[PDB]
Amino acid sequence: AMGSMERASLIQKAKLAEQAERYEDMAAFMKGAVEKGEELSCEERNLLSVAYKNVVGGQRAAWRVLSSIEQKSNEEGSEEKGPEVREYREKVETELQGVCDTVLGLLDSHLIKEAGDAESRVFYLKMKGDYYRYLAEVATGDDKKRIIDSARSAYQEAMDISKKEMPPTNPIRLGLALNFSVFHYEIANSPEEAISLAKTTFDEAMADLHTLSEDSYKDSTLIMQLLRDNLTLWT
Amino acid sequence: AMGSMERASLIQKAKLAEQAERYEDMAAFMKGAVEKGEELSCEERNLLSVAYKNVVGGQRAAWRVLSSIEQKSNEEGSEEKGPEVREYREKVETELQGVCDTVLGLLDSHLIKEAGDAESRVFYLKMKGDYYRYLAEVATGDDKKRIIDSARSAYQEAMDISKKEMPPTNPIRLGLALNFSVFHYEIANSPEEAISLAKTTFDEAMADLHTLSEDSYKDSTLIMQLLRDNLTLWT
Amino acid sequence: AISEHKSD
Amino acid sequence: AISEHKSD
Ligand SMILES: [Cl-]
Ligand SMILES: [Cl-]
Ligand SMILES: [Mg+2]
Ligand SMILES: [Mg+2]
Ligand SMILES: [Mg+2]
Ligand SMILES: [Mg+2]
């Protein structure tokens, strides 16, 4: 994608697109950068993640609005009004699935296989879990179970590496645990597993904060607060 | 556009897209509705306007961010870093110009010529002024003057009809005067004309508020407050 | 300025 | 719930 643009120019333009809040452009620039075939630095991995999180986030928010309207239309006493709500929800759903499939394709061709360091491998396997989780949010057919299992398997492999290779305050390790706990709660119907994971992760991070500089302490405690926010909603 | 979709389904889906904050889709649905060739009702005119205002609004905000970065790069002491800022600003600019050209095309083929009532004709001529004004904001070549004149001419024709055919509190009349005053201030370098127009419009509306119901009074005073906000910034 | 600055 | 609910 963007095959005639230099890799450095694609990265530079992704940063400009981020400043301009042009996330579809940012994602396209980063997709082009990945397709150059070189590994991504930590900053470049963050740009890839920010770009697609914002694109899929808009699609998810729209899908939730449309799904709610569609569910209300299927209640007792609701007037017919036709196929339009379902059609338009399906359109948005298909577009969201396409974005997820594109991110999963980048991870599979060939980000994950070329990621040897723990920081890069865990980042990409967390992303794989996240985008299968977004596919799961809208899945209703005979592959929902396989989609859920793919998300679980990616998060589990990421968690196994993170626990062996990263300290408990590492922001990627923390964000992974946060998102896997949300997977348990919202996708896997395992609220107790979600609560246990969030609590253990929070407590183990708290016990390690003494090792950190002021800036690393700020980074870790910001994510810890998100675990606490979920625990307060769930308990 | 969307030639196989029923007009009513396009309108219904534009309203769903608005609820989902999917403004590019909303604009495409409304473009398809216009291209059916029937006149638009007042509600449908508002949907067309909301959809394209939000699309172009995002593009304008991005263009302003990129133009500011580009201007800083051209100051004394700024390091080179290459063609990327200009290229990306040009990309966004071209996309914004394309959206303006699409709206102007709908007005010219054939919304304006089929609009005989004052409410519809003034609405469309105001839109024509607005989208030439957005073209003017980014124009720098040998047609800037002709673009500015096209915006002026459309606003002037709208104003002449509005003053003859609508009361001074009419929300479309008020929004037209507000936007023509912004044209004077920001595009035409005529801050005194902008201030005079905003003041006269505000005062003439205030004098007519006694004729209105509670709901029409709320509608008119909301727009009057925008005139006052500009006057406080300009004086 | 607001259009409908504040603009409309 | 927040992902990175609150999510990451
Ligand atoms: Cl549709
Ligand atoms: Cl570009
Ligand atoms: Mg090269
Ligand atoms: Mg490697
Ligand atoms: Mg028909
Ligand atoms: Mg007519």
Distance CA A193, CA B180 (A): 60
Classified as helix, coil or strand, A2 is coil
Whether A185 has its CB under 8 Å from any CB of chain D: the answer is yes
> What distances in angstroms separate CA A216 from CA A205, B101, B126, B215, one per listed residue?
12, 50, 54, 55
End-to-end CA distance of chain D: 11
Q: In whole angstroms, what is the distance from residue B177 CA to residue A157 CA?
A: 62
Helices (H), A115-190: 118-138, 144-165, 171-182
| CA-based nearest distance D3→chain A, Å | 5
- Do residues A190 and A184 make contact, with C-beta atoms less than 8 angstroms apart? yes
Whole-number Å distance, alpha carbon A179 to ligand 4 midpoint, is 25
* Bridge partners for D6 per DSSP: D2, D3
Data resolution in angstroms:
1.3
Q: Do B12 and A84 touch (CB under 8 A)?
A: yes
> What single-letter amino acid sits at A59?
Q
Q: DSSP characters for B1-25?
A: --TTS-HHHHHHHHHHHHHTT-HHH
Which method was used? X-ray
CB proximity A6 to B under 8 Å: no
* Cα D7 to Cα A177: distance, rounded to the nearest angstrom: 10
Contact B66 A16 (CB under 8 A): yes
Alpha-carbon radius of gyration of chain B: 19
Would you call the peptide bond into A110 cis, given omega within 30 degrees of 0 as the criterion? yes
Write out the two tokens for A183.
Answer: 């997977």
Residue B216 CA to its chain's centroid (Å): 22
What residue has token string 């230099």?
A: A6
Enumerate the β-bridge partners of residue C2. C6
User: Can you tell me the distance from the alpha carbon of B174 to that of C2, in angstroms, rounded to the nearest whole number?
Assistant: 13
A54 in reach of chain D (CB within 8 A): no
CA of A10 to the centre of ligand 2 (A): 8
Nearest 5 degrees, angle CA B47-CA B51-CA B57?
140
Amino acid, single-letter form, for residue B28: A
Task: Report angle CA A77, A83, A86 to the nearest 5 degrees.
Answer: 90
Which chains form contacts with chain A, at 3 or more CB pairs under 8 Å?
A: B, D
Q: Which of A174, A223, A230 sits opposite D1 (nearest CB)?
A: A230
Contact A22, B92 (CB under 8 A): yes
CA distance A68 to A65: 5
Q: Give yes or no for a contact between A54 and A23, defined as CB atoms under 8 angstroms apart.
A: yes
> Rounded distance, CA B194 to CA B234, Å?
9
Q: How far apart are CA A191 and CA A230, in angstroms?
A: 11
Q: Which tokens is A226 given?
A: 């998100």
User: Count of residues for chain B?
Assistant: 235
Render B97-140 in DSSP notation, one character per residue. Answer: HHHHHHHHHHIIIIIHHH--SHHHHHHHHHHHHHHHHHHHHH--
Give SS3 for D7.
strand
DSSP track, A41-89: PHHHHHHHHHHHHHHHHHHHHHHHHHHHHHHHHTSTT-----SHHHHHH
Write down the residue that tokens 């082009």 correspond to: A32
User: B224: closest CA among C6, A135, A15?
Assistant: C6
Chains in touch with B (3+ beta-carbon pairs under 8 Å) read A, C
User: Measuring CA to CA, which residue among B123, B62, B132 is closest to residue B103?
Assistant: B132
Look at C3 and B223 and tell me if their CB atoms are within 8 Å: no
Residues 6+ apart with CB under 8 A from A26: A14, A17, A18, A47, A50, A51, A54
User: Are A82 and B9 a contacting pair at CB < 8 A?
Assistant: yes
Q: What does each C-alpha distance from A234 to A24, A181, A195, A210, D2 come to in angstroms? A: 34, 11, 7, 28, 11
Which of A19, A22, A85 lies nearest to residue B16, judging by beta carbons?
Answer: A85
